[PDB]
Design a protein around this nucleic acid. Sequence first.
RNA 1: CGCAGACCACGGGAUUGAUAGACCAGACCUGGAAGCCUAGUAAUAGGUGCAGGGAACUGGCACUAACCGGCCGAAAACUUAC
RNA 2: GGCACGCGAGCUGGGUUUAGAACGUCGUGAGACAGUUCGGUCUCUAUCCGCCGCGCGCGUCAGAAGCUUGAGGAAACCUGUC
RNA 3: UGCAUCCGGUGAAGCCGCCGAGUGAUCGAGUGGUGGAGGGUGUGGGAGUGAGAAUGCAGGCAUGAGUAGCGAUUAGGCAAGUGAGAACCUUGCCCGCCGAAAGACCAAGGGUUCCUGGGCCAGGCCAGUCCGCCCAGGGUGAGUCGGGACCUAAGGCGAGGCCG
RNA 4: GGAGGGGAGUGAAAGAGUACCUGAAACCGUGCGCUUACAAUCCGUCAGAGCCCUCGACGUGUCGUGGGGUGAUGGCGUGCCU
Lengths: 54, 118, 45, 113
Amino acid sequence: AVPKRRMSRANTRSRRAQWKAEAPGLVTVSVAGQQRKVPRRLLKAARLGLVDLD
Amino acid sequence: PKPTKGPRLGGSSSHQSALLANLATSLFEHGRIKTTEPKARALRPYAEKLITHAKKGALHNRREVMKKIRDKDVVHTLFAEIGPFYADRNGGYTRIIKVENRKGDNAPMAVIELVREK
Amino acid sequence: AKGKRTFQPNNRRRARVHGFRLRMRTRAGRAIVANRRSKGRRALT
Amino acid sequence: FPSATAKARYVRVSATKARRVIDLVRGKSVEEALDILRWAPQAASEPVAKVIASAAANAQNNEGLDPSTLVVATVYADEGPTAKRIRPRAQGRAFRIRKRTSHITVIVESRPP
RNA sequence: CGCAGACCACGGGAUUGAUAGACCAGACCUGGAAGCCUAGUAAUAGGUGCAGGGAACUGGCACUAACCGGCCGAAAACUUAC
RNA sequence: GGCACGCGAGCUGGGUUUAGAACGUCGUGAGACAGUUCGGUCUCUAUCCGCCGCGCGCGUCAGAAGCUUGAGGAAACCUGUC
RNA sequence: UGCAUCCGGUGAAGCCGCCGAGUGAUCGAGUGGUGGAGGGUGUGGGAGUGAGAAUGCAGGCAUGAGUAGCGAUUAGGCAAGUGAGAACCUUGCCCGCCGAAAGACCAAGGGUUCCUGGGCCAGGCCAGUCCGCCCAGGGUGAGUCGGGACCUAAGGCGAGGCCG
RNA sequence: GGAGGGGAGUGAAAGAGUACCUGAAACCGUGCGCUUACAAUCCGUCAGAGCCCUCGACGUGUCGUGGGGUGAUGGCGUGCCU
């Protein structure tokens, strides 16, 4: 099937606003002294020195 | 152990079996490897049961391990150090650590390693 | 599966069917060459 | 408010994909925006983080502003020139492929704690 | 993590823990492992021995992983009657 | 019995309805026959309404949590022998 | 555009506004911004003189939509390295696939794609530090191999010639 | 890392930066004001509450020969061309 009509701007924008990214949550950690933010999923790996912090 | 509920890892059952054997060989050879998180999740019970075979290390258990491992140096190390090292630990010979995602395909990565505490 | 295409390159065939000497052999070919020269074509034949 | 700006032009990402990442760091402090972009699982986060870091460096260096008091005040992505390619298709038809770019503008400013 | 499930949602657990895996035992499926000994020229058979191997089911067991953690989220009053 | 004698962006292609070929009949002939016979490409990623399921947001005059009443709807309704 | 007048780097046209105007097409020698070299008015002369539609033409850009697809029937894994950056590049060890082939060598065709060094905007259906991509330099050695200088087939051209 | 940009300079001008005179529309953003999640809308028009901005007059907010933006709500209303 093909679109019979051109979308209006309102409908296009209302549907398009649902394509978005969520912000990952960050927790603090102490690696080599300096505090820095890290996802909680990687807390243990950061404490073991397995995640590269730039 | 428990088979996978969904589609197999490598794209077929035989590829998954070969993949598990190779990953277990690499883990016992190096002590820790890095791979995708589902691969390590599937690897844990497989490697742990191989270590269980090596713990009560007899000829029968040795042949049981060799019908999976296919690498003889790894078999020797598994039956000469790894087995004795875990003599008085009941299960939990490995641990899984989640690490940063891959860049090319955003694949979740994890590190599986043998415990060395005691 | 018969996937033979119309163009099958062969340089001697090209020269013997469209080459300069064949064009110059006949009056119509000479007229063709003269027309291509007058049009300014780089490759006359 | 004192402010500094930085612009990345002809970045080879489409504007919508950049906006998806930009919508995460609006009105946030520079350090927390940089952390968010460091841990965002999108490819557009690297260019945007580079623009924000460049703007913060501009603020600290040229205007001598305190980096700890910087805030991502204004940020948006526009459309750059788009290049036209062709993807051949079934039964002899050819389709158009667009290679879009974008310009990213960031304005940081010093705000009291 | 699940017998909940396209995603999401739903349900349970999160060290004050049996949630999943491992380990130990049972149930069940297969059907008598390897090695050794004996008999036979050999093919092969018998003993050791309801053996060995093993997923989902049941019970134990903190050995491994549930983490020195983040984000949300609570009250204008007035009128009349009692 | 109605609903495009319901229903091919749900399916078929046996019949009818292209191009090949043959029989009878008609035409000098090319051909023809609401006569027969054999063979013969059924395309599409669902925009909107509709419908089947599942979420997110806000509302229900503070913020929450258990257990519920039901206006209103849907399902089911068959029958025999001894 | 003839003629006559007036404005203009102390800022023309064009464009975007504000504030107004005419019965209409429209107007603003009213104004602000932008801009940077030519315009206005009167009266005559001449038109490639007015678009909303021809399944019109060219350029630019939407909608579908961040959707379909990312090209077979073999399958990848790990460690180390390089590097700003690695699922894809390098090295090693495994695993798998072809094996009258998915191995090796010619002809036709292609034309520098070959090697060394360098590069990483374009291209590669992702990325790329890699490449049949880009840049520079280098590389093809024959009495005997395949051809000519040897010979003819079909066929072509054809001195004179015959026919027209 | 580069690309790119920010200062600094050249220039009468960088709202002239070898993507370069002027820089319109479609199309895509960001910020501010008003509005919008009980509602059947050829999307306008006529009345019109509320909110916001602005020009005058008088006090402190309150009208006026006012002006603009948005518009809850009511009435009417079957796109253009051929």
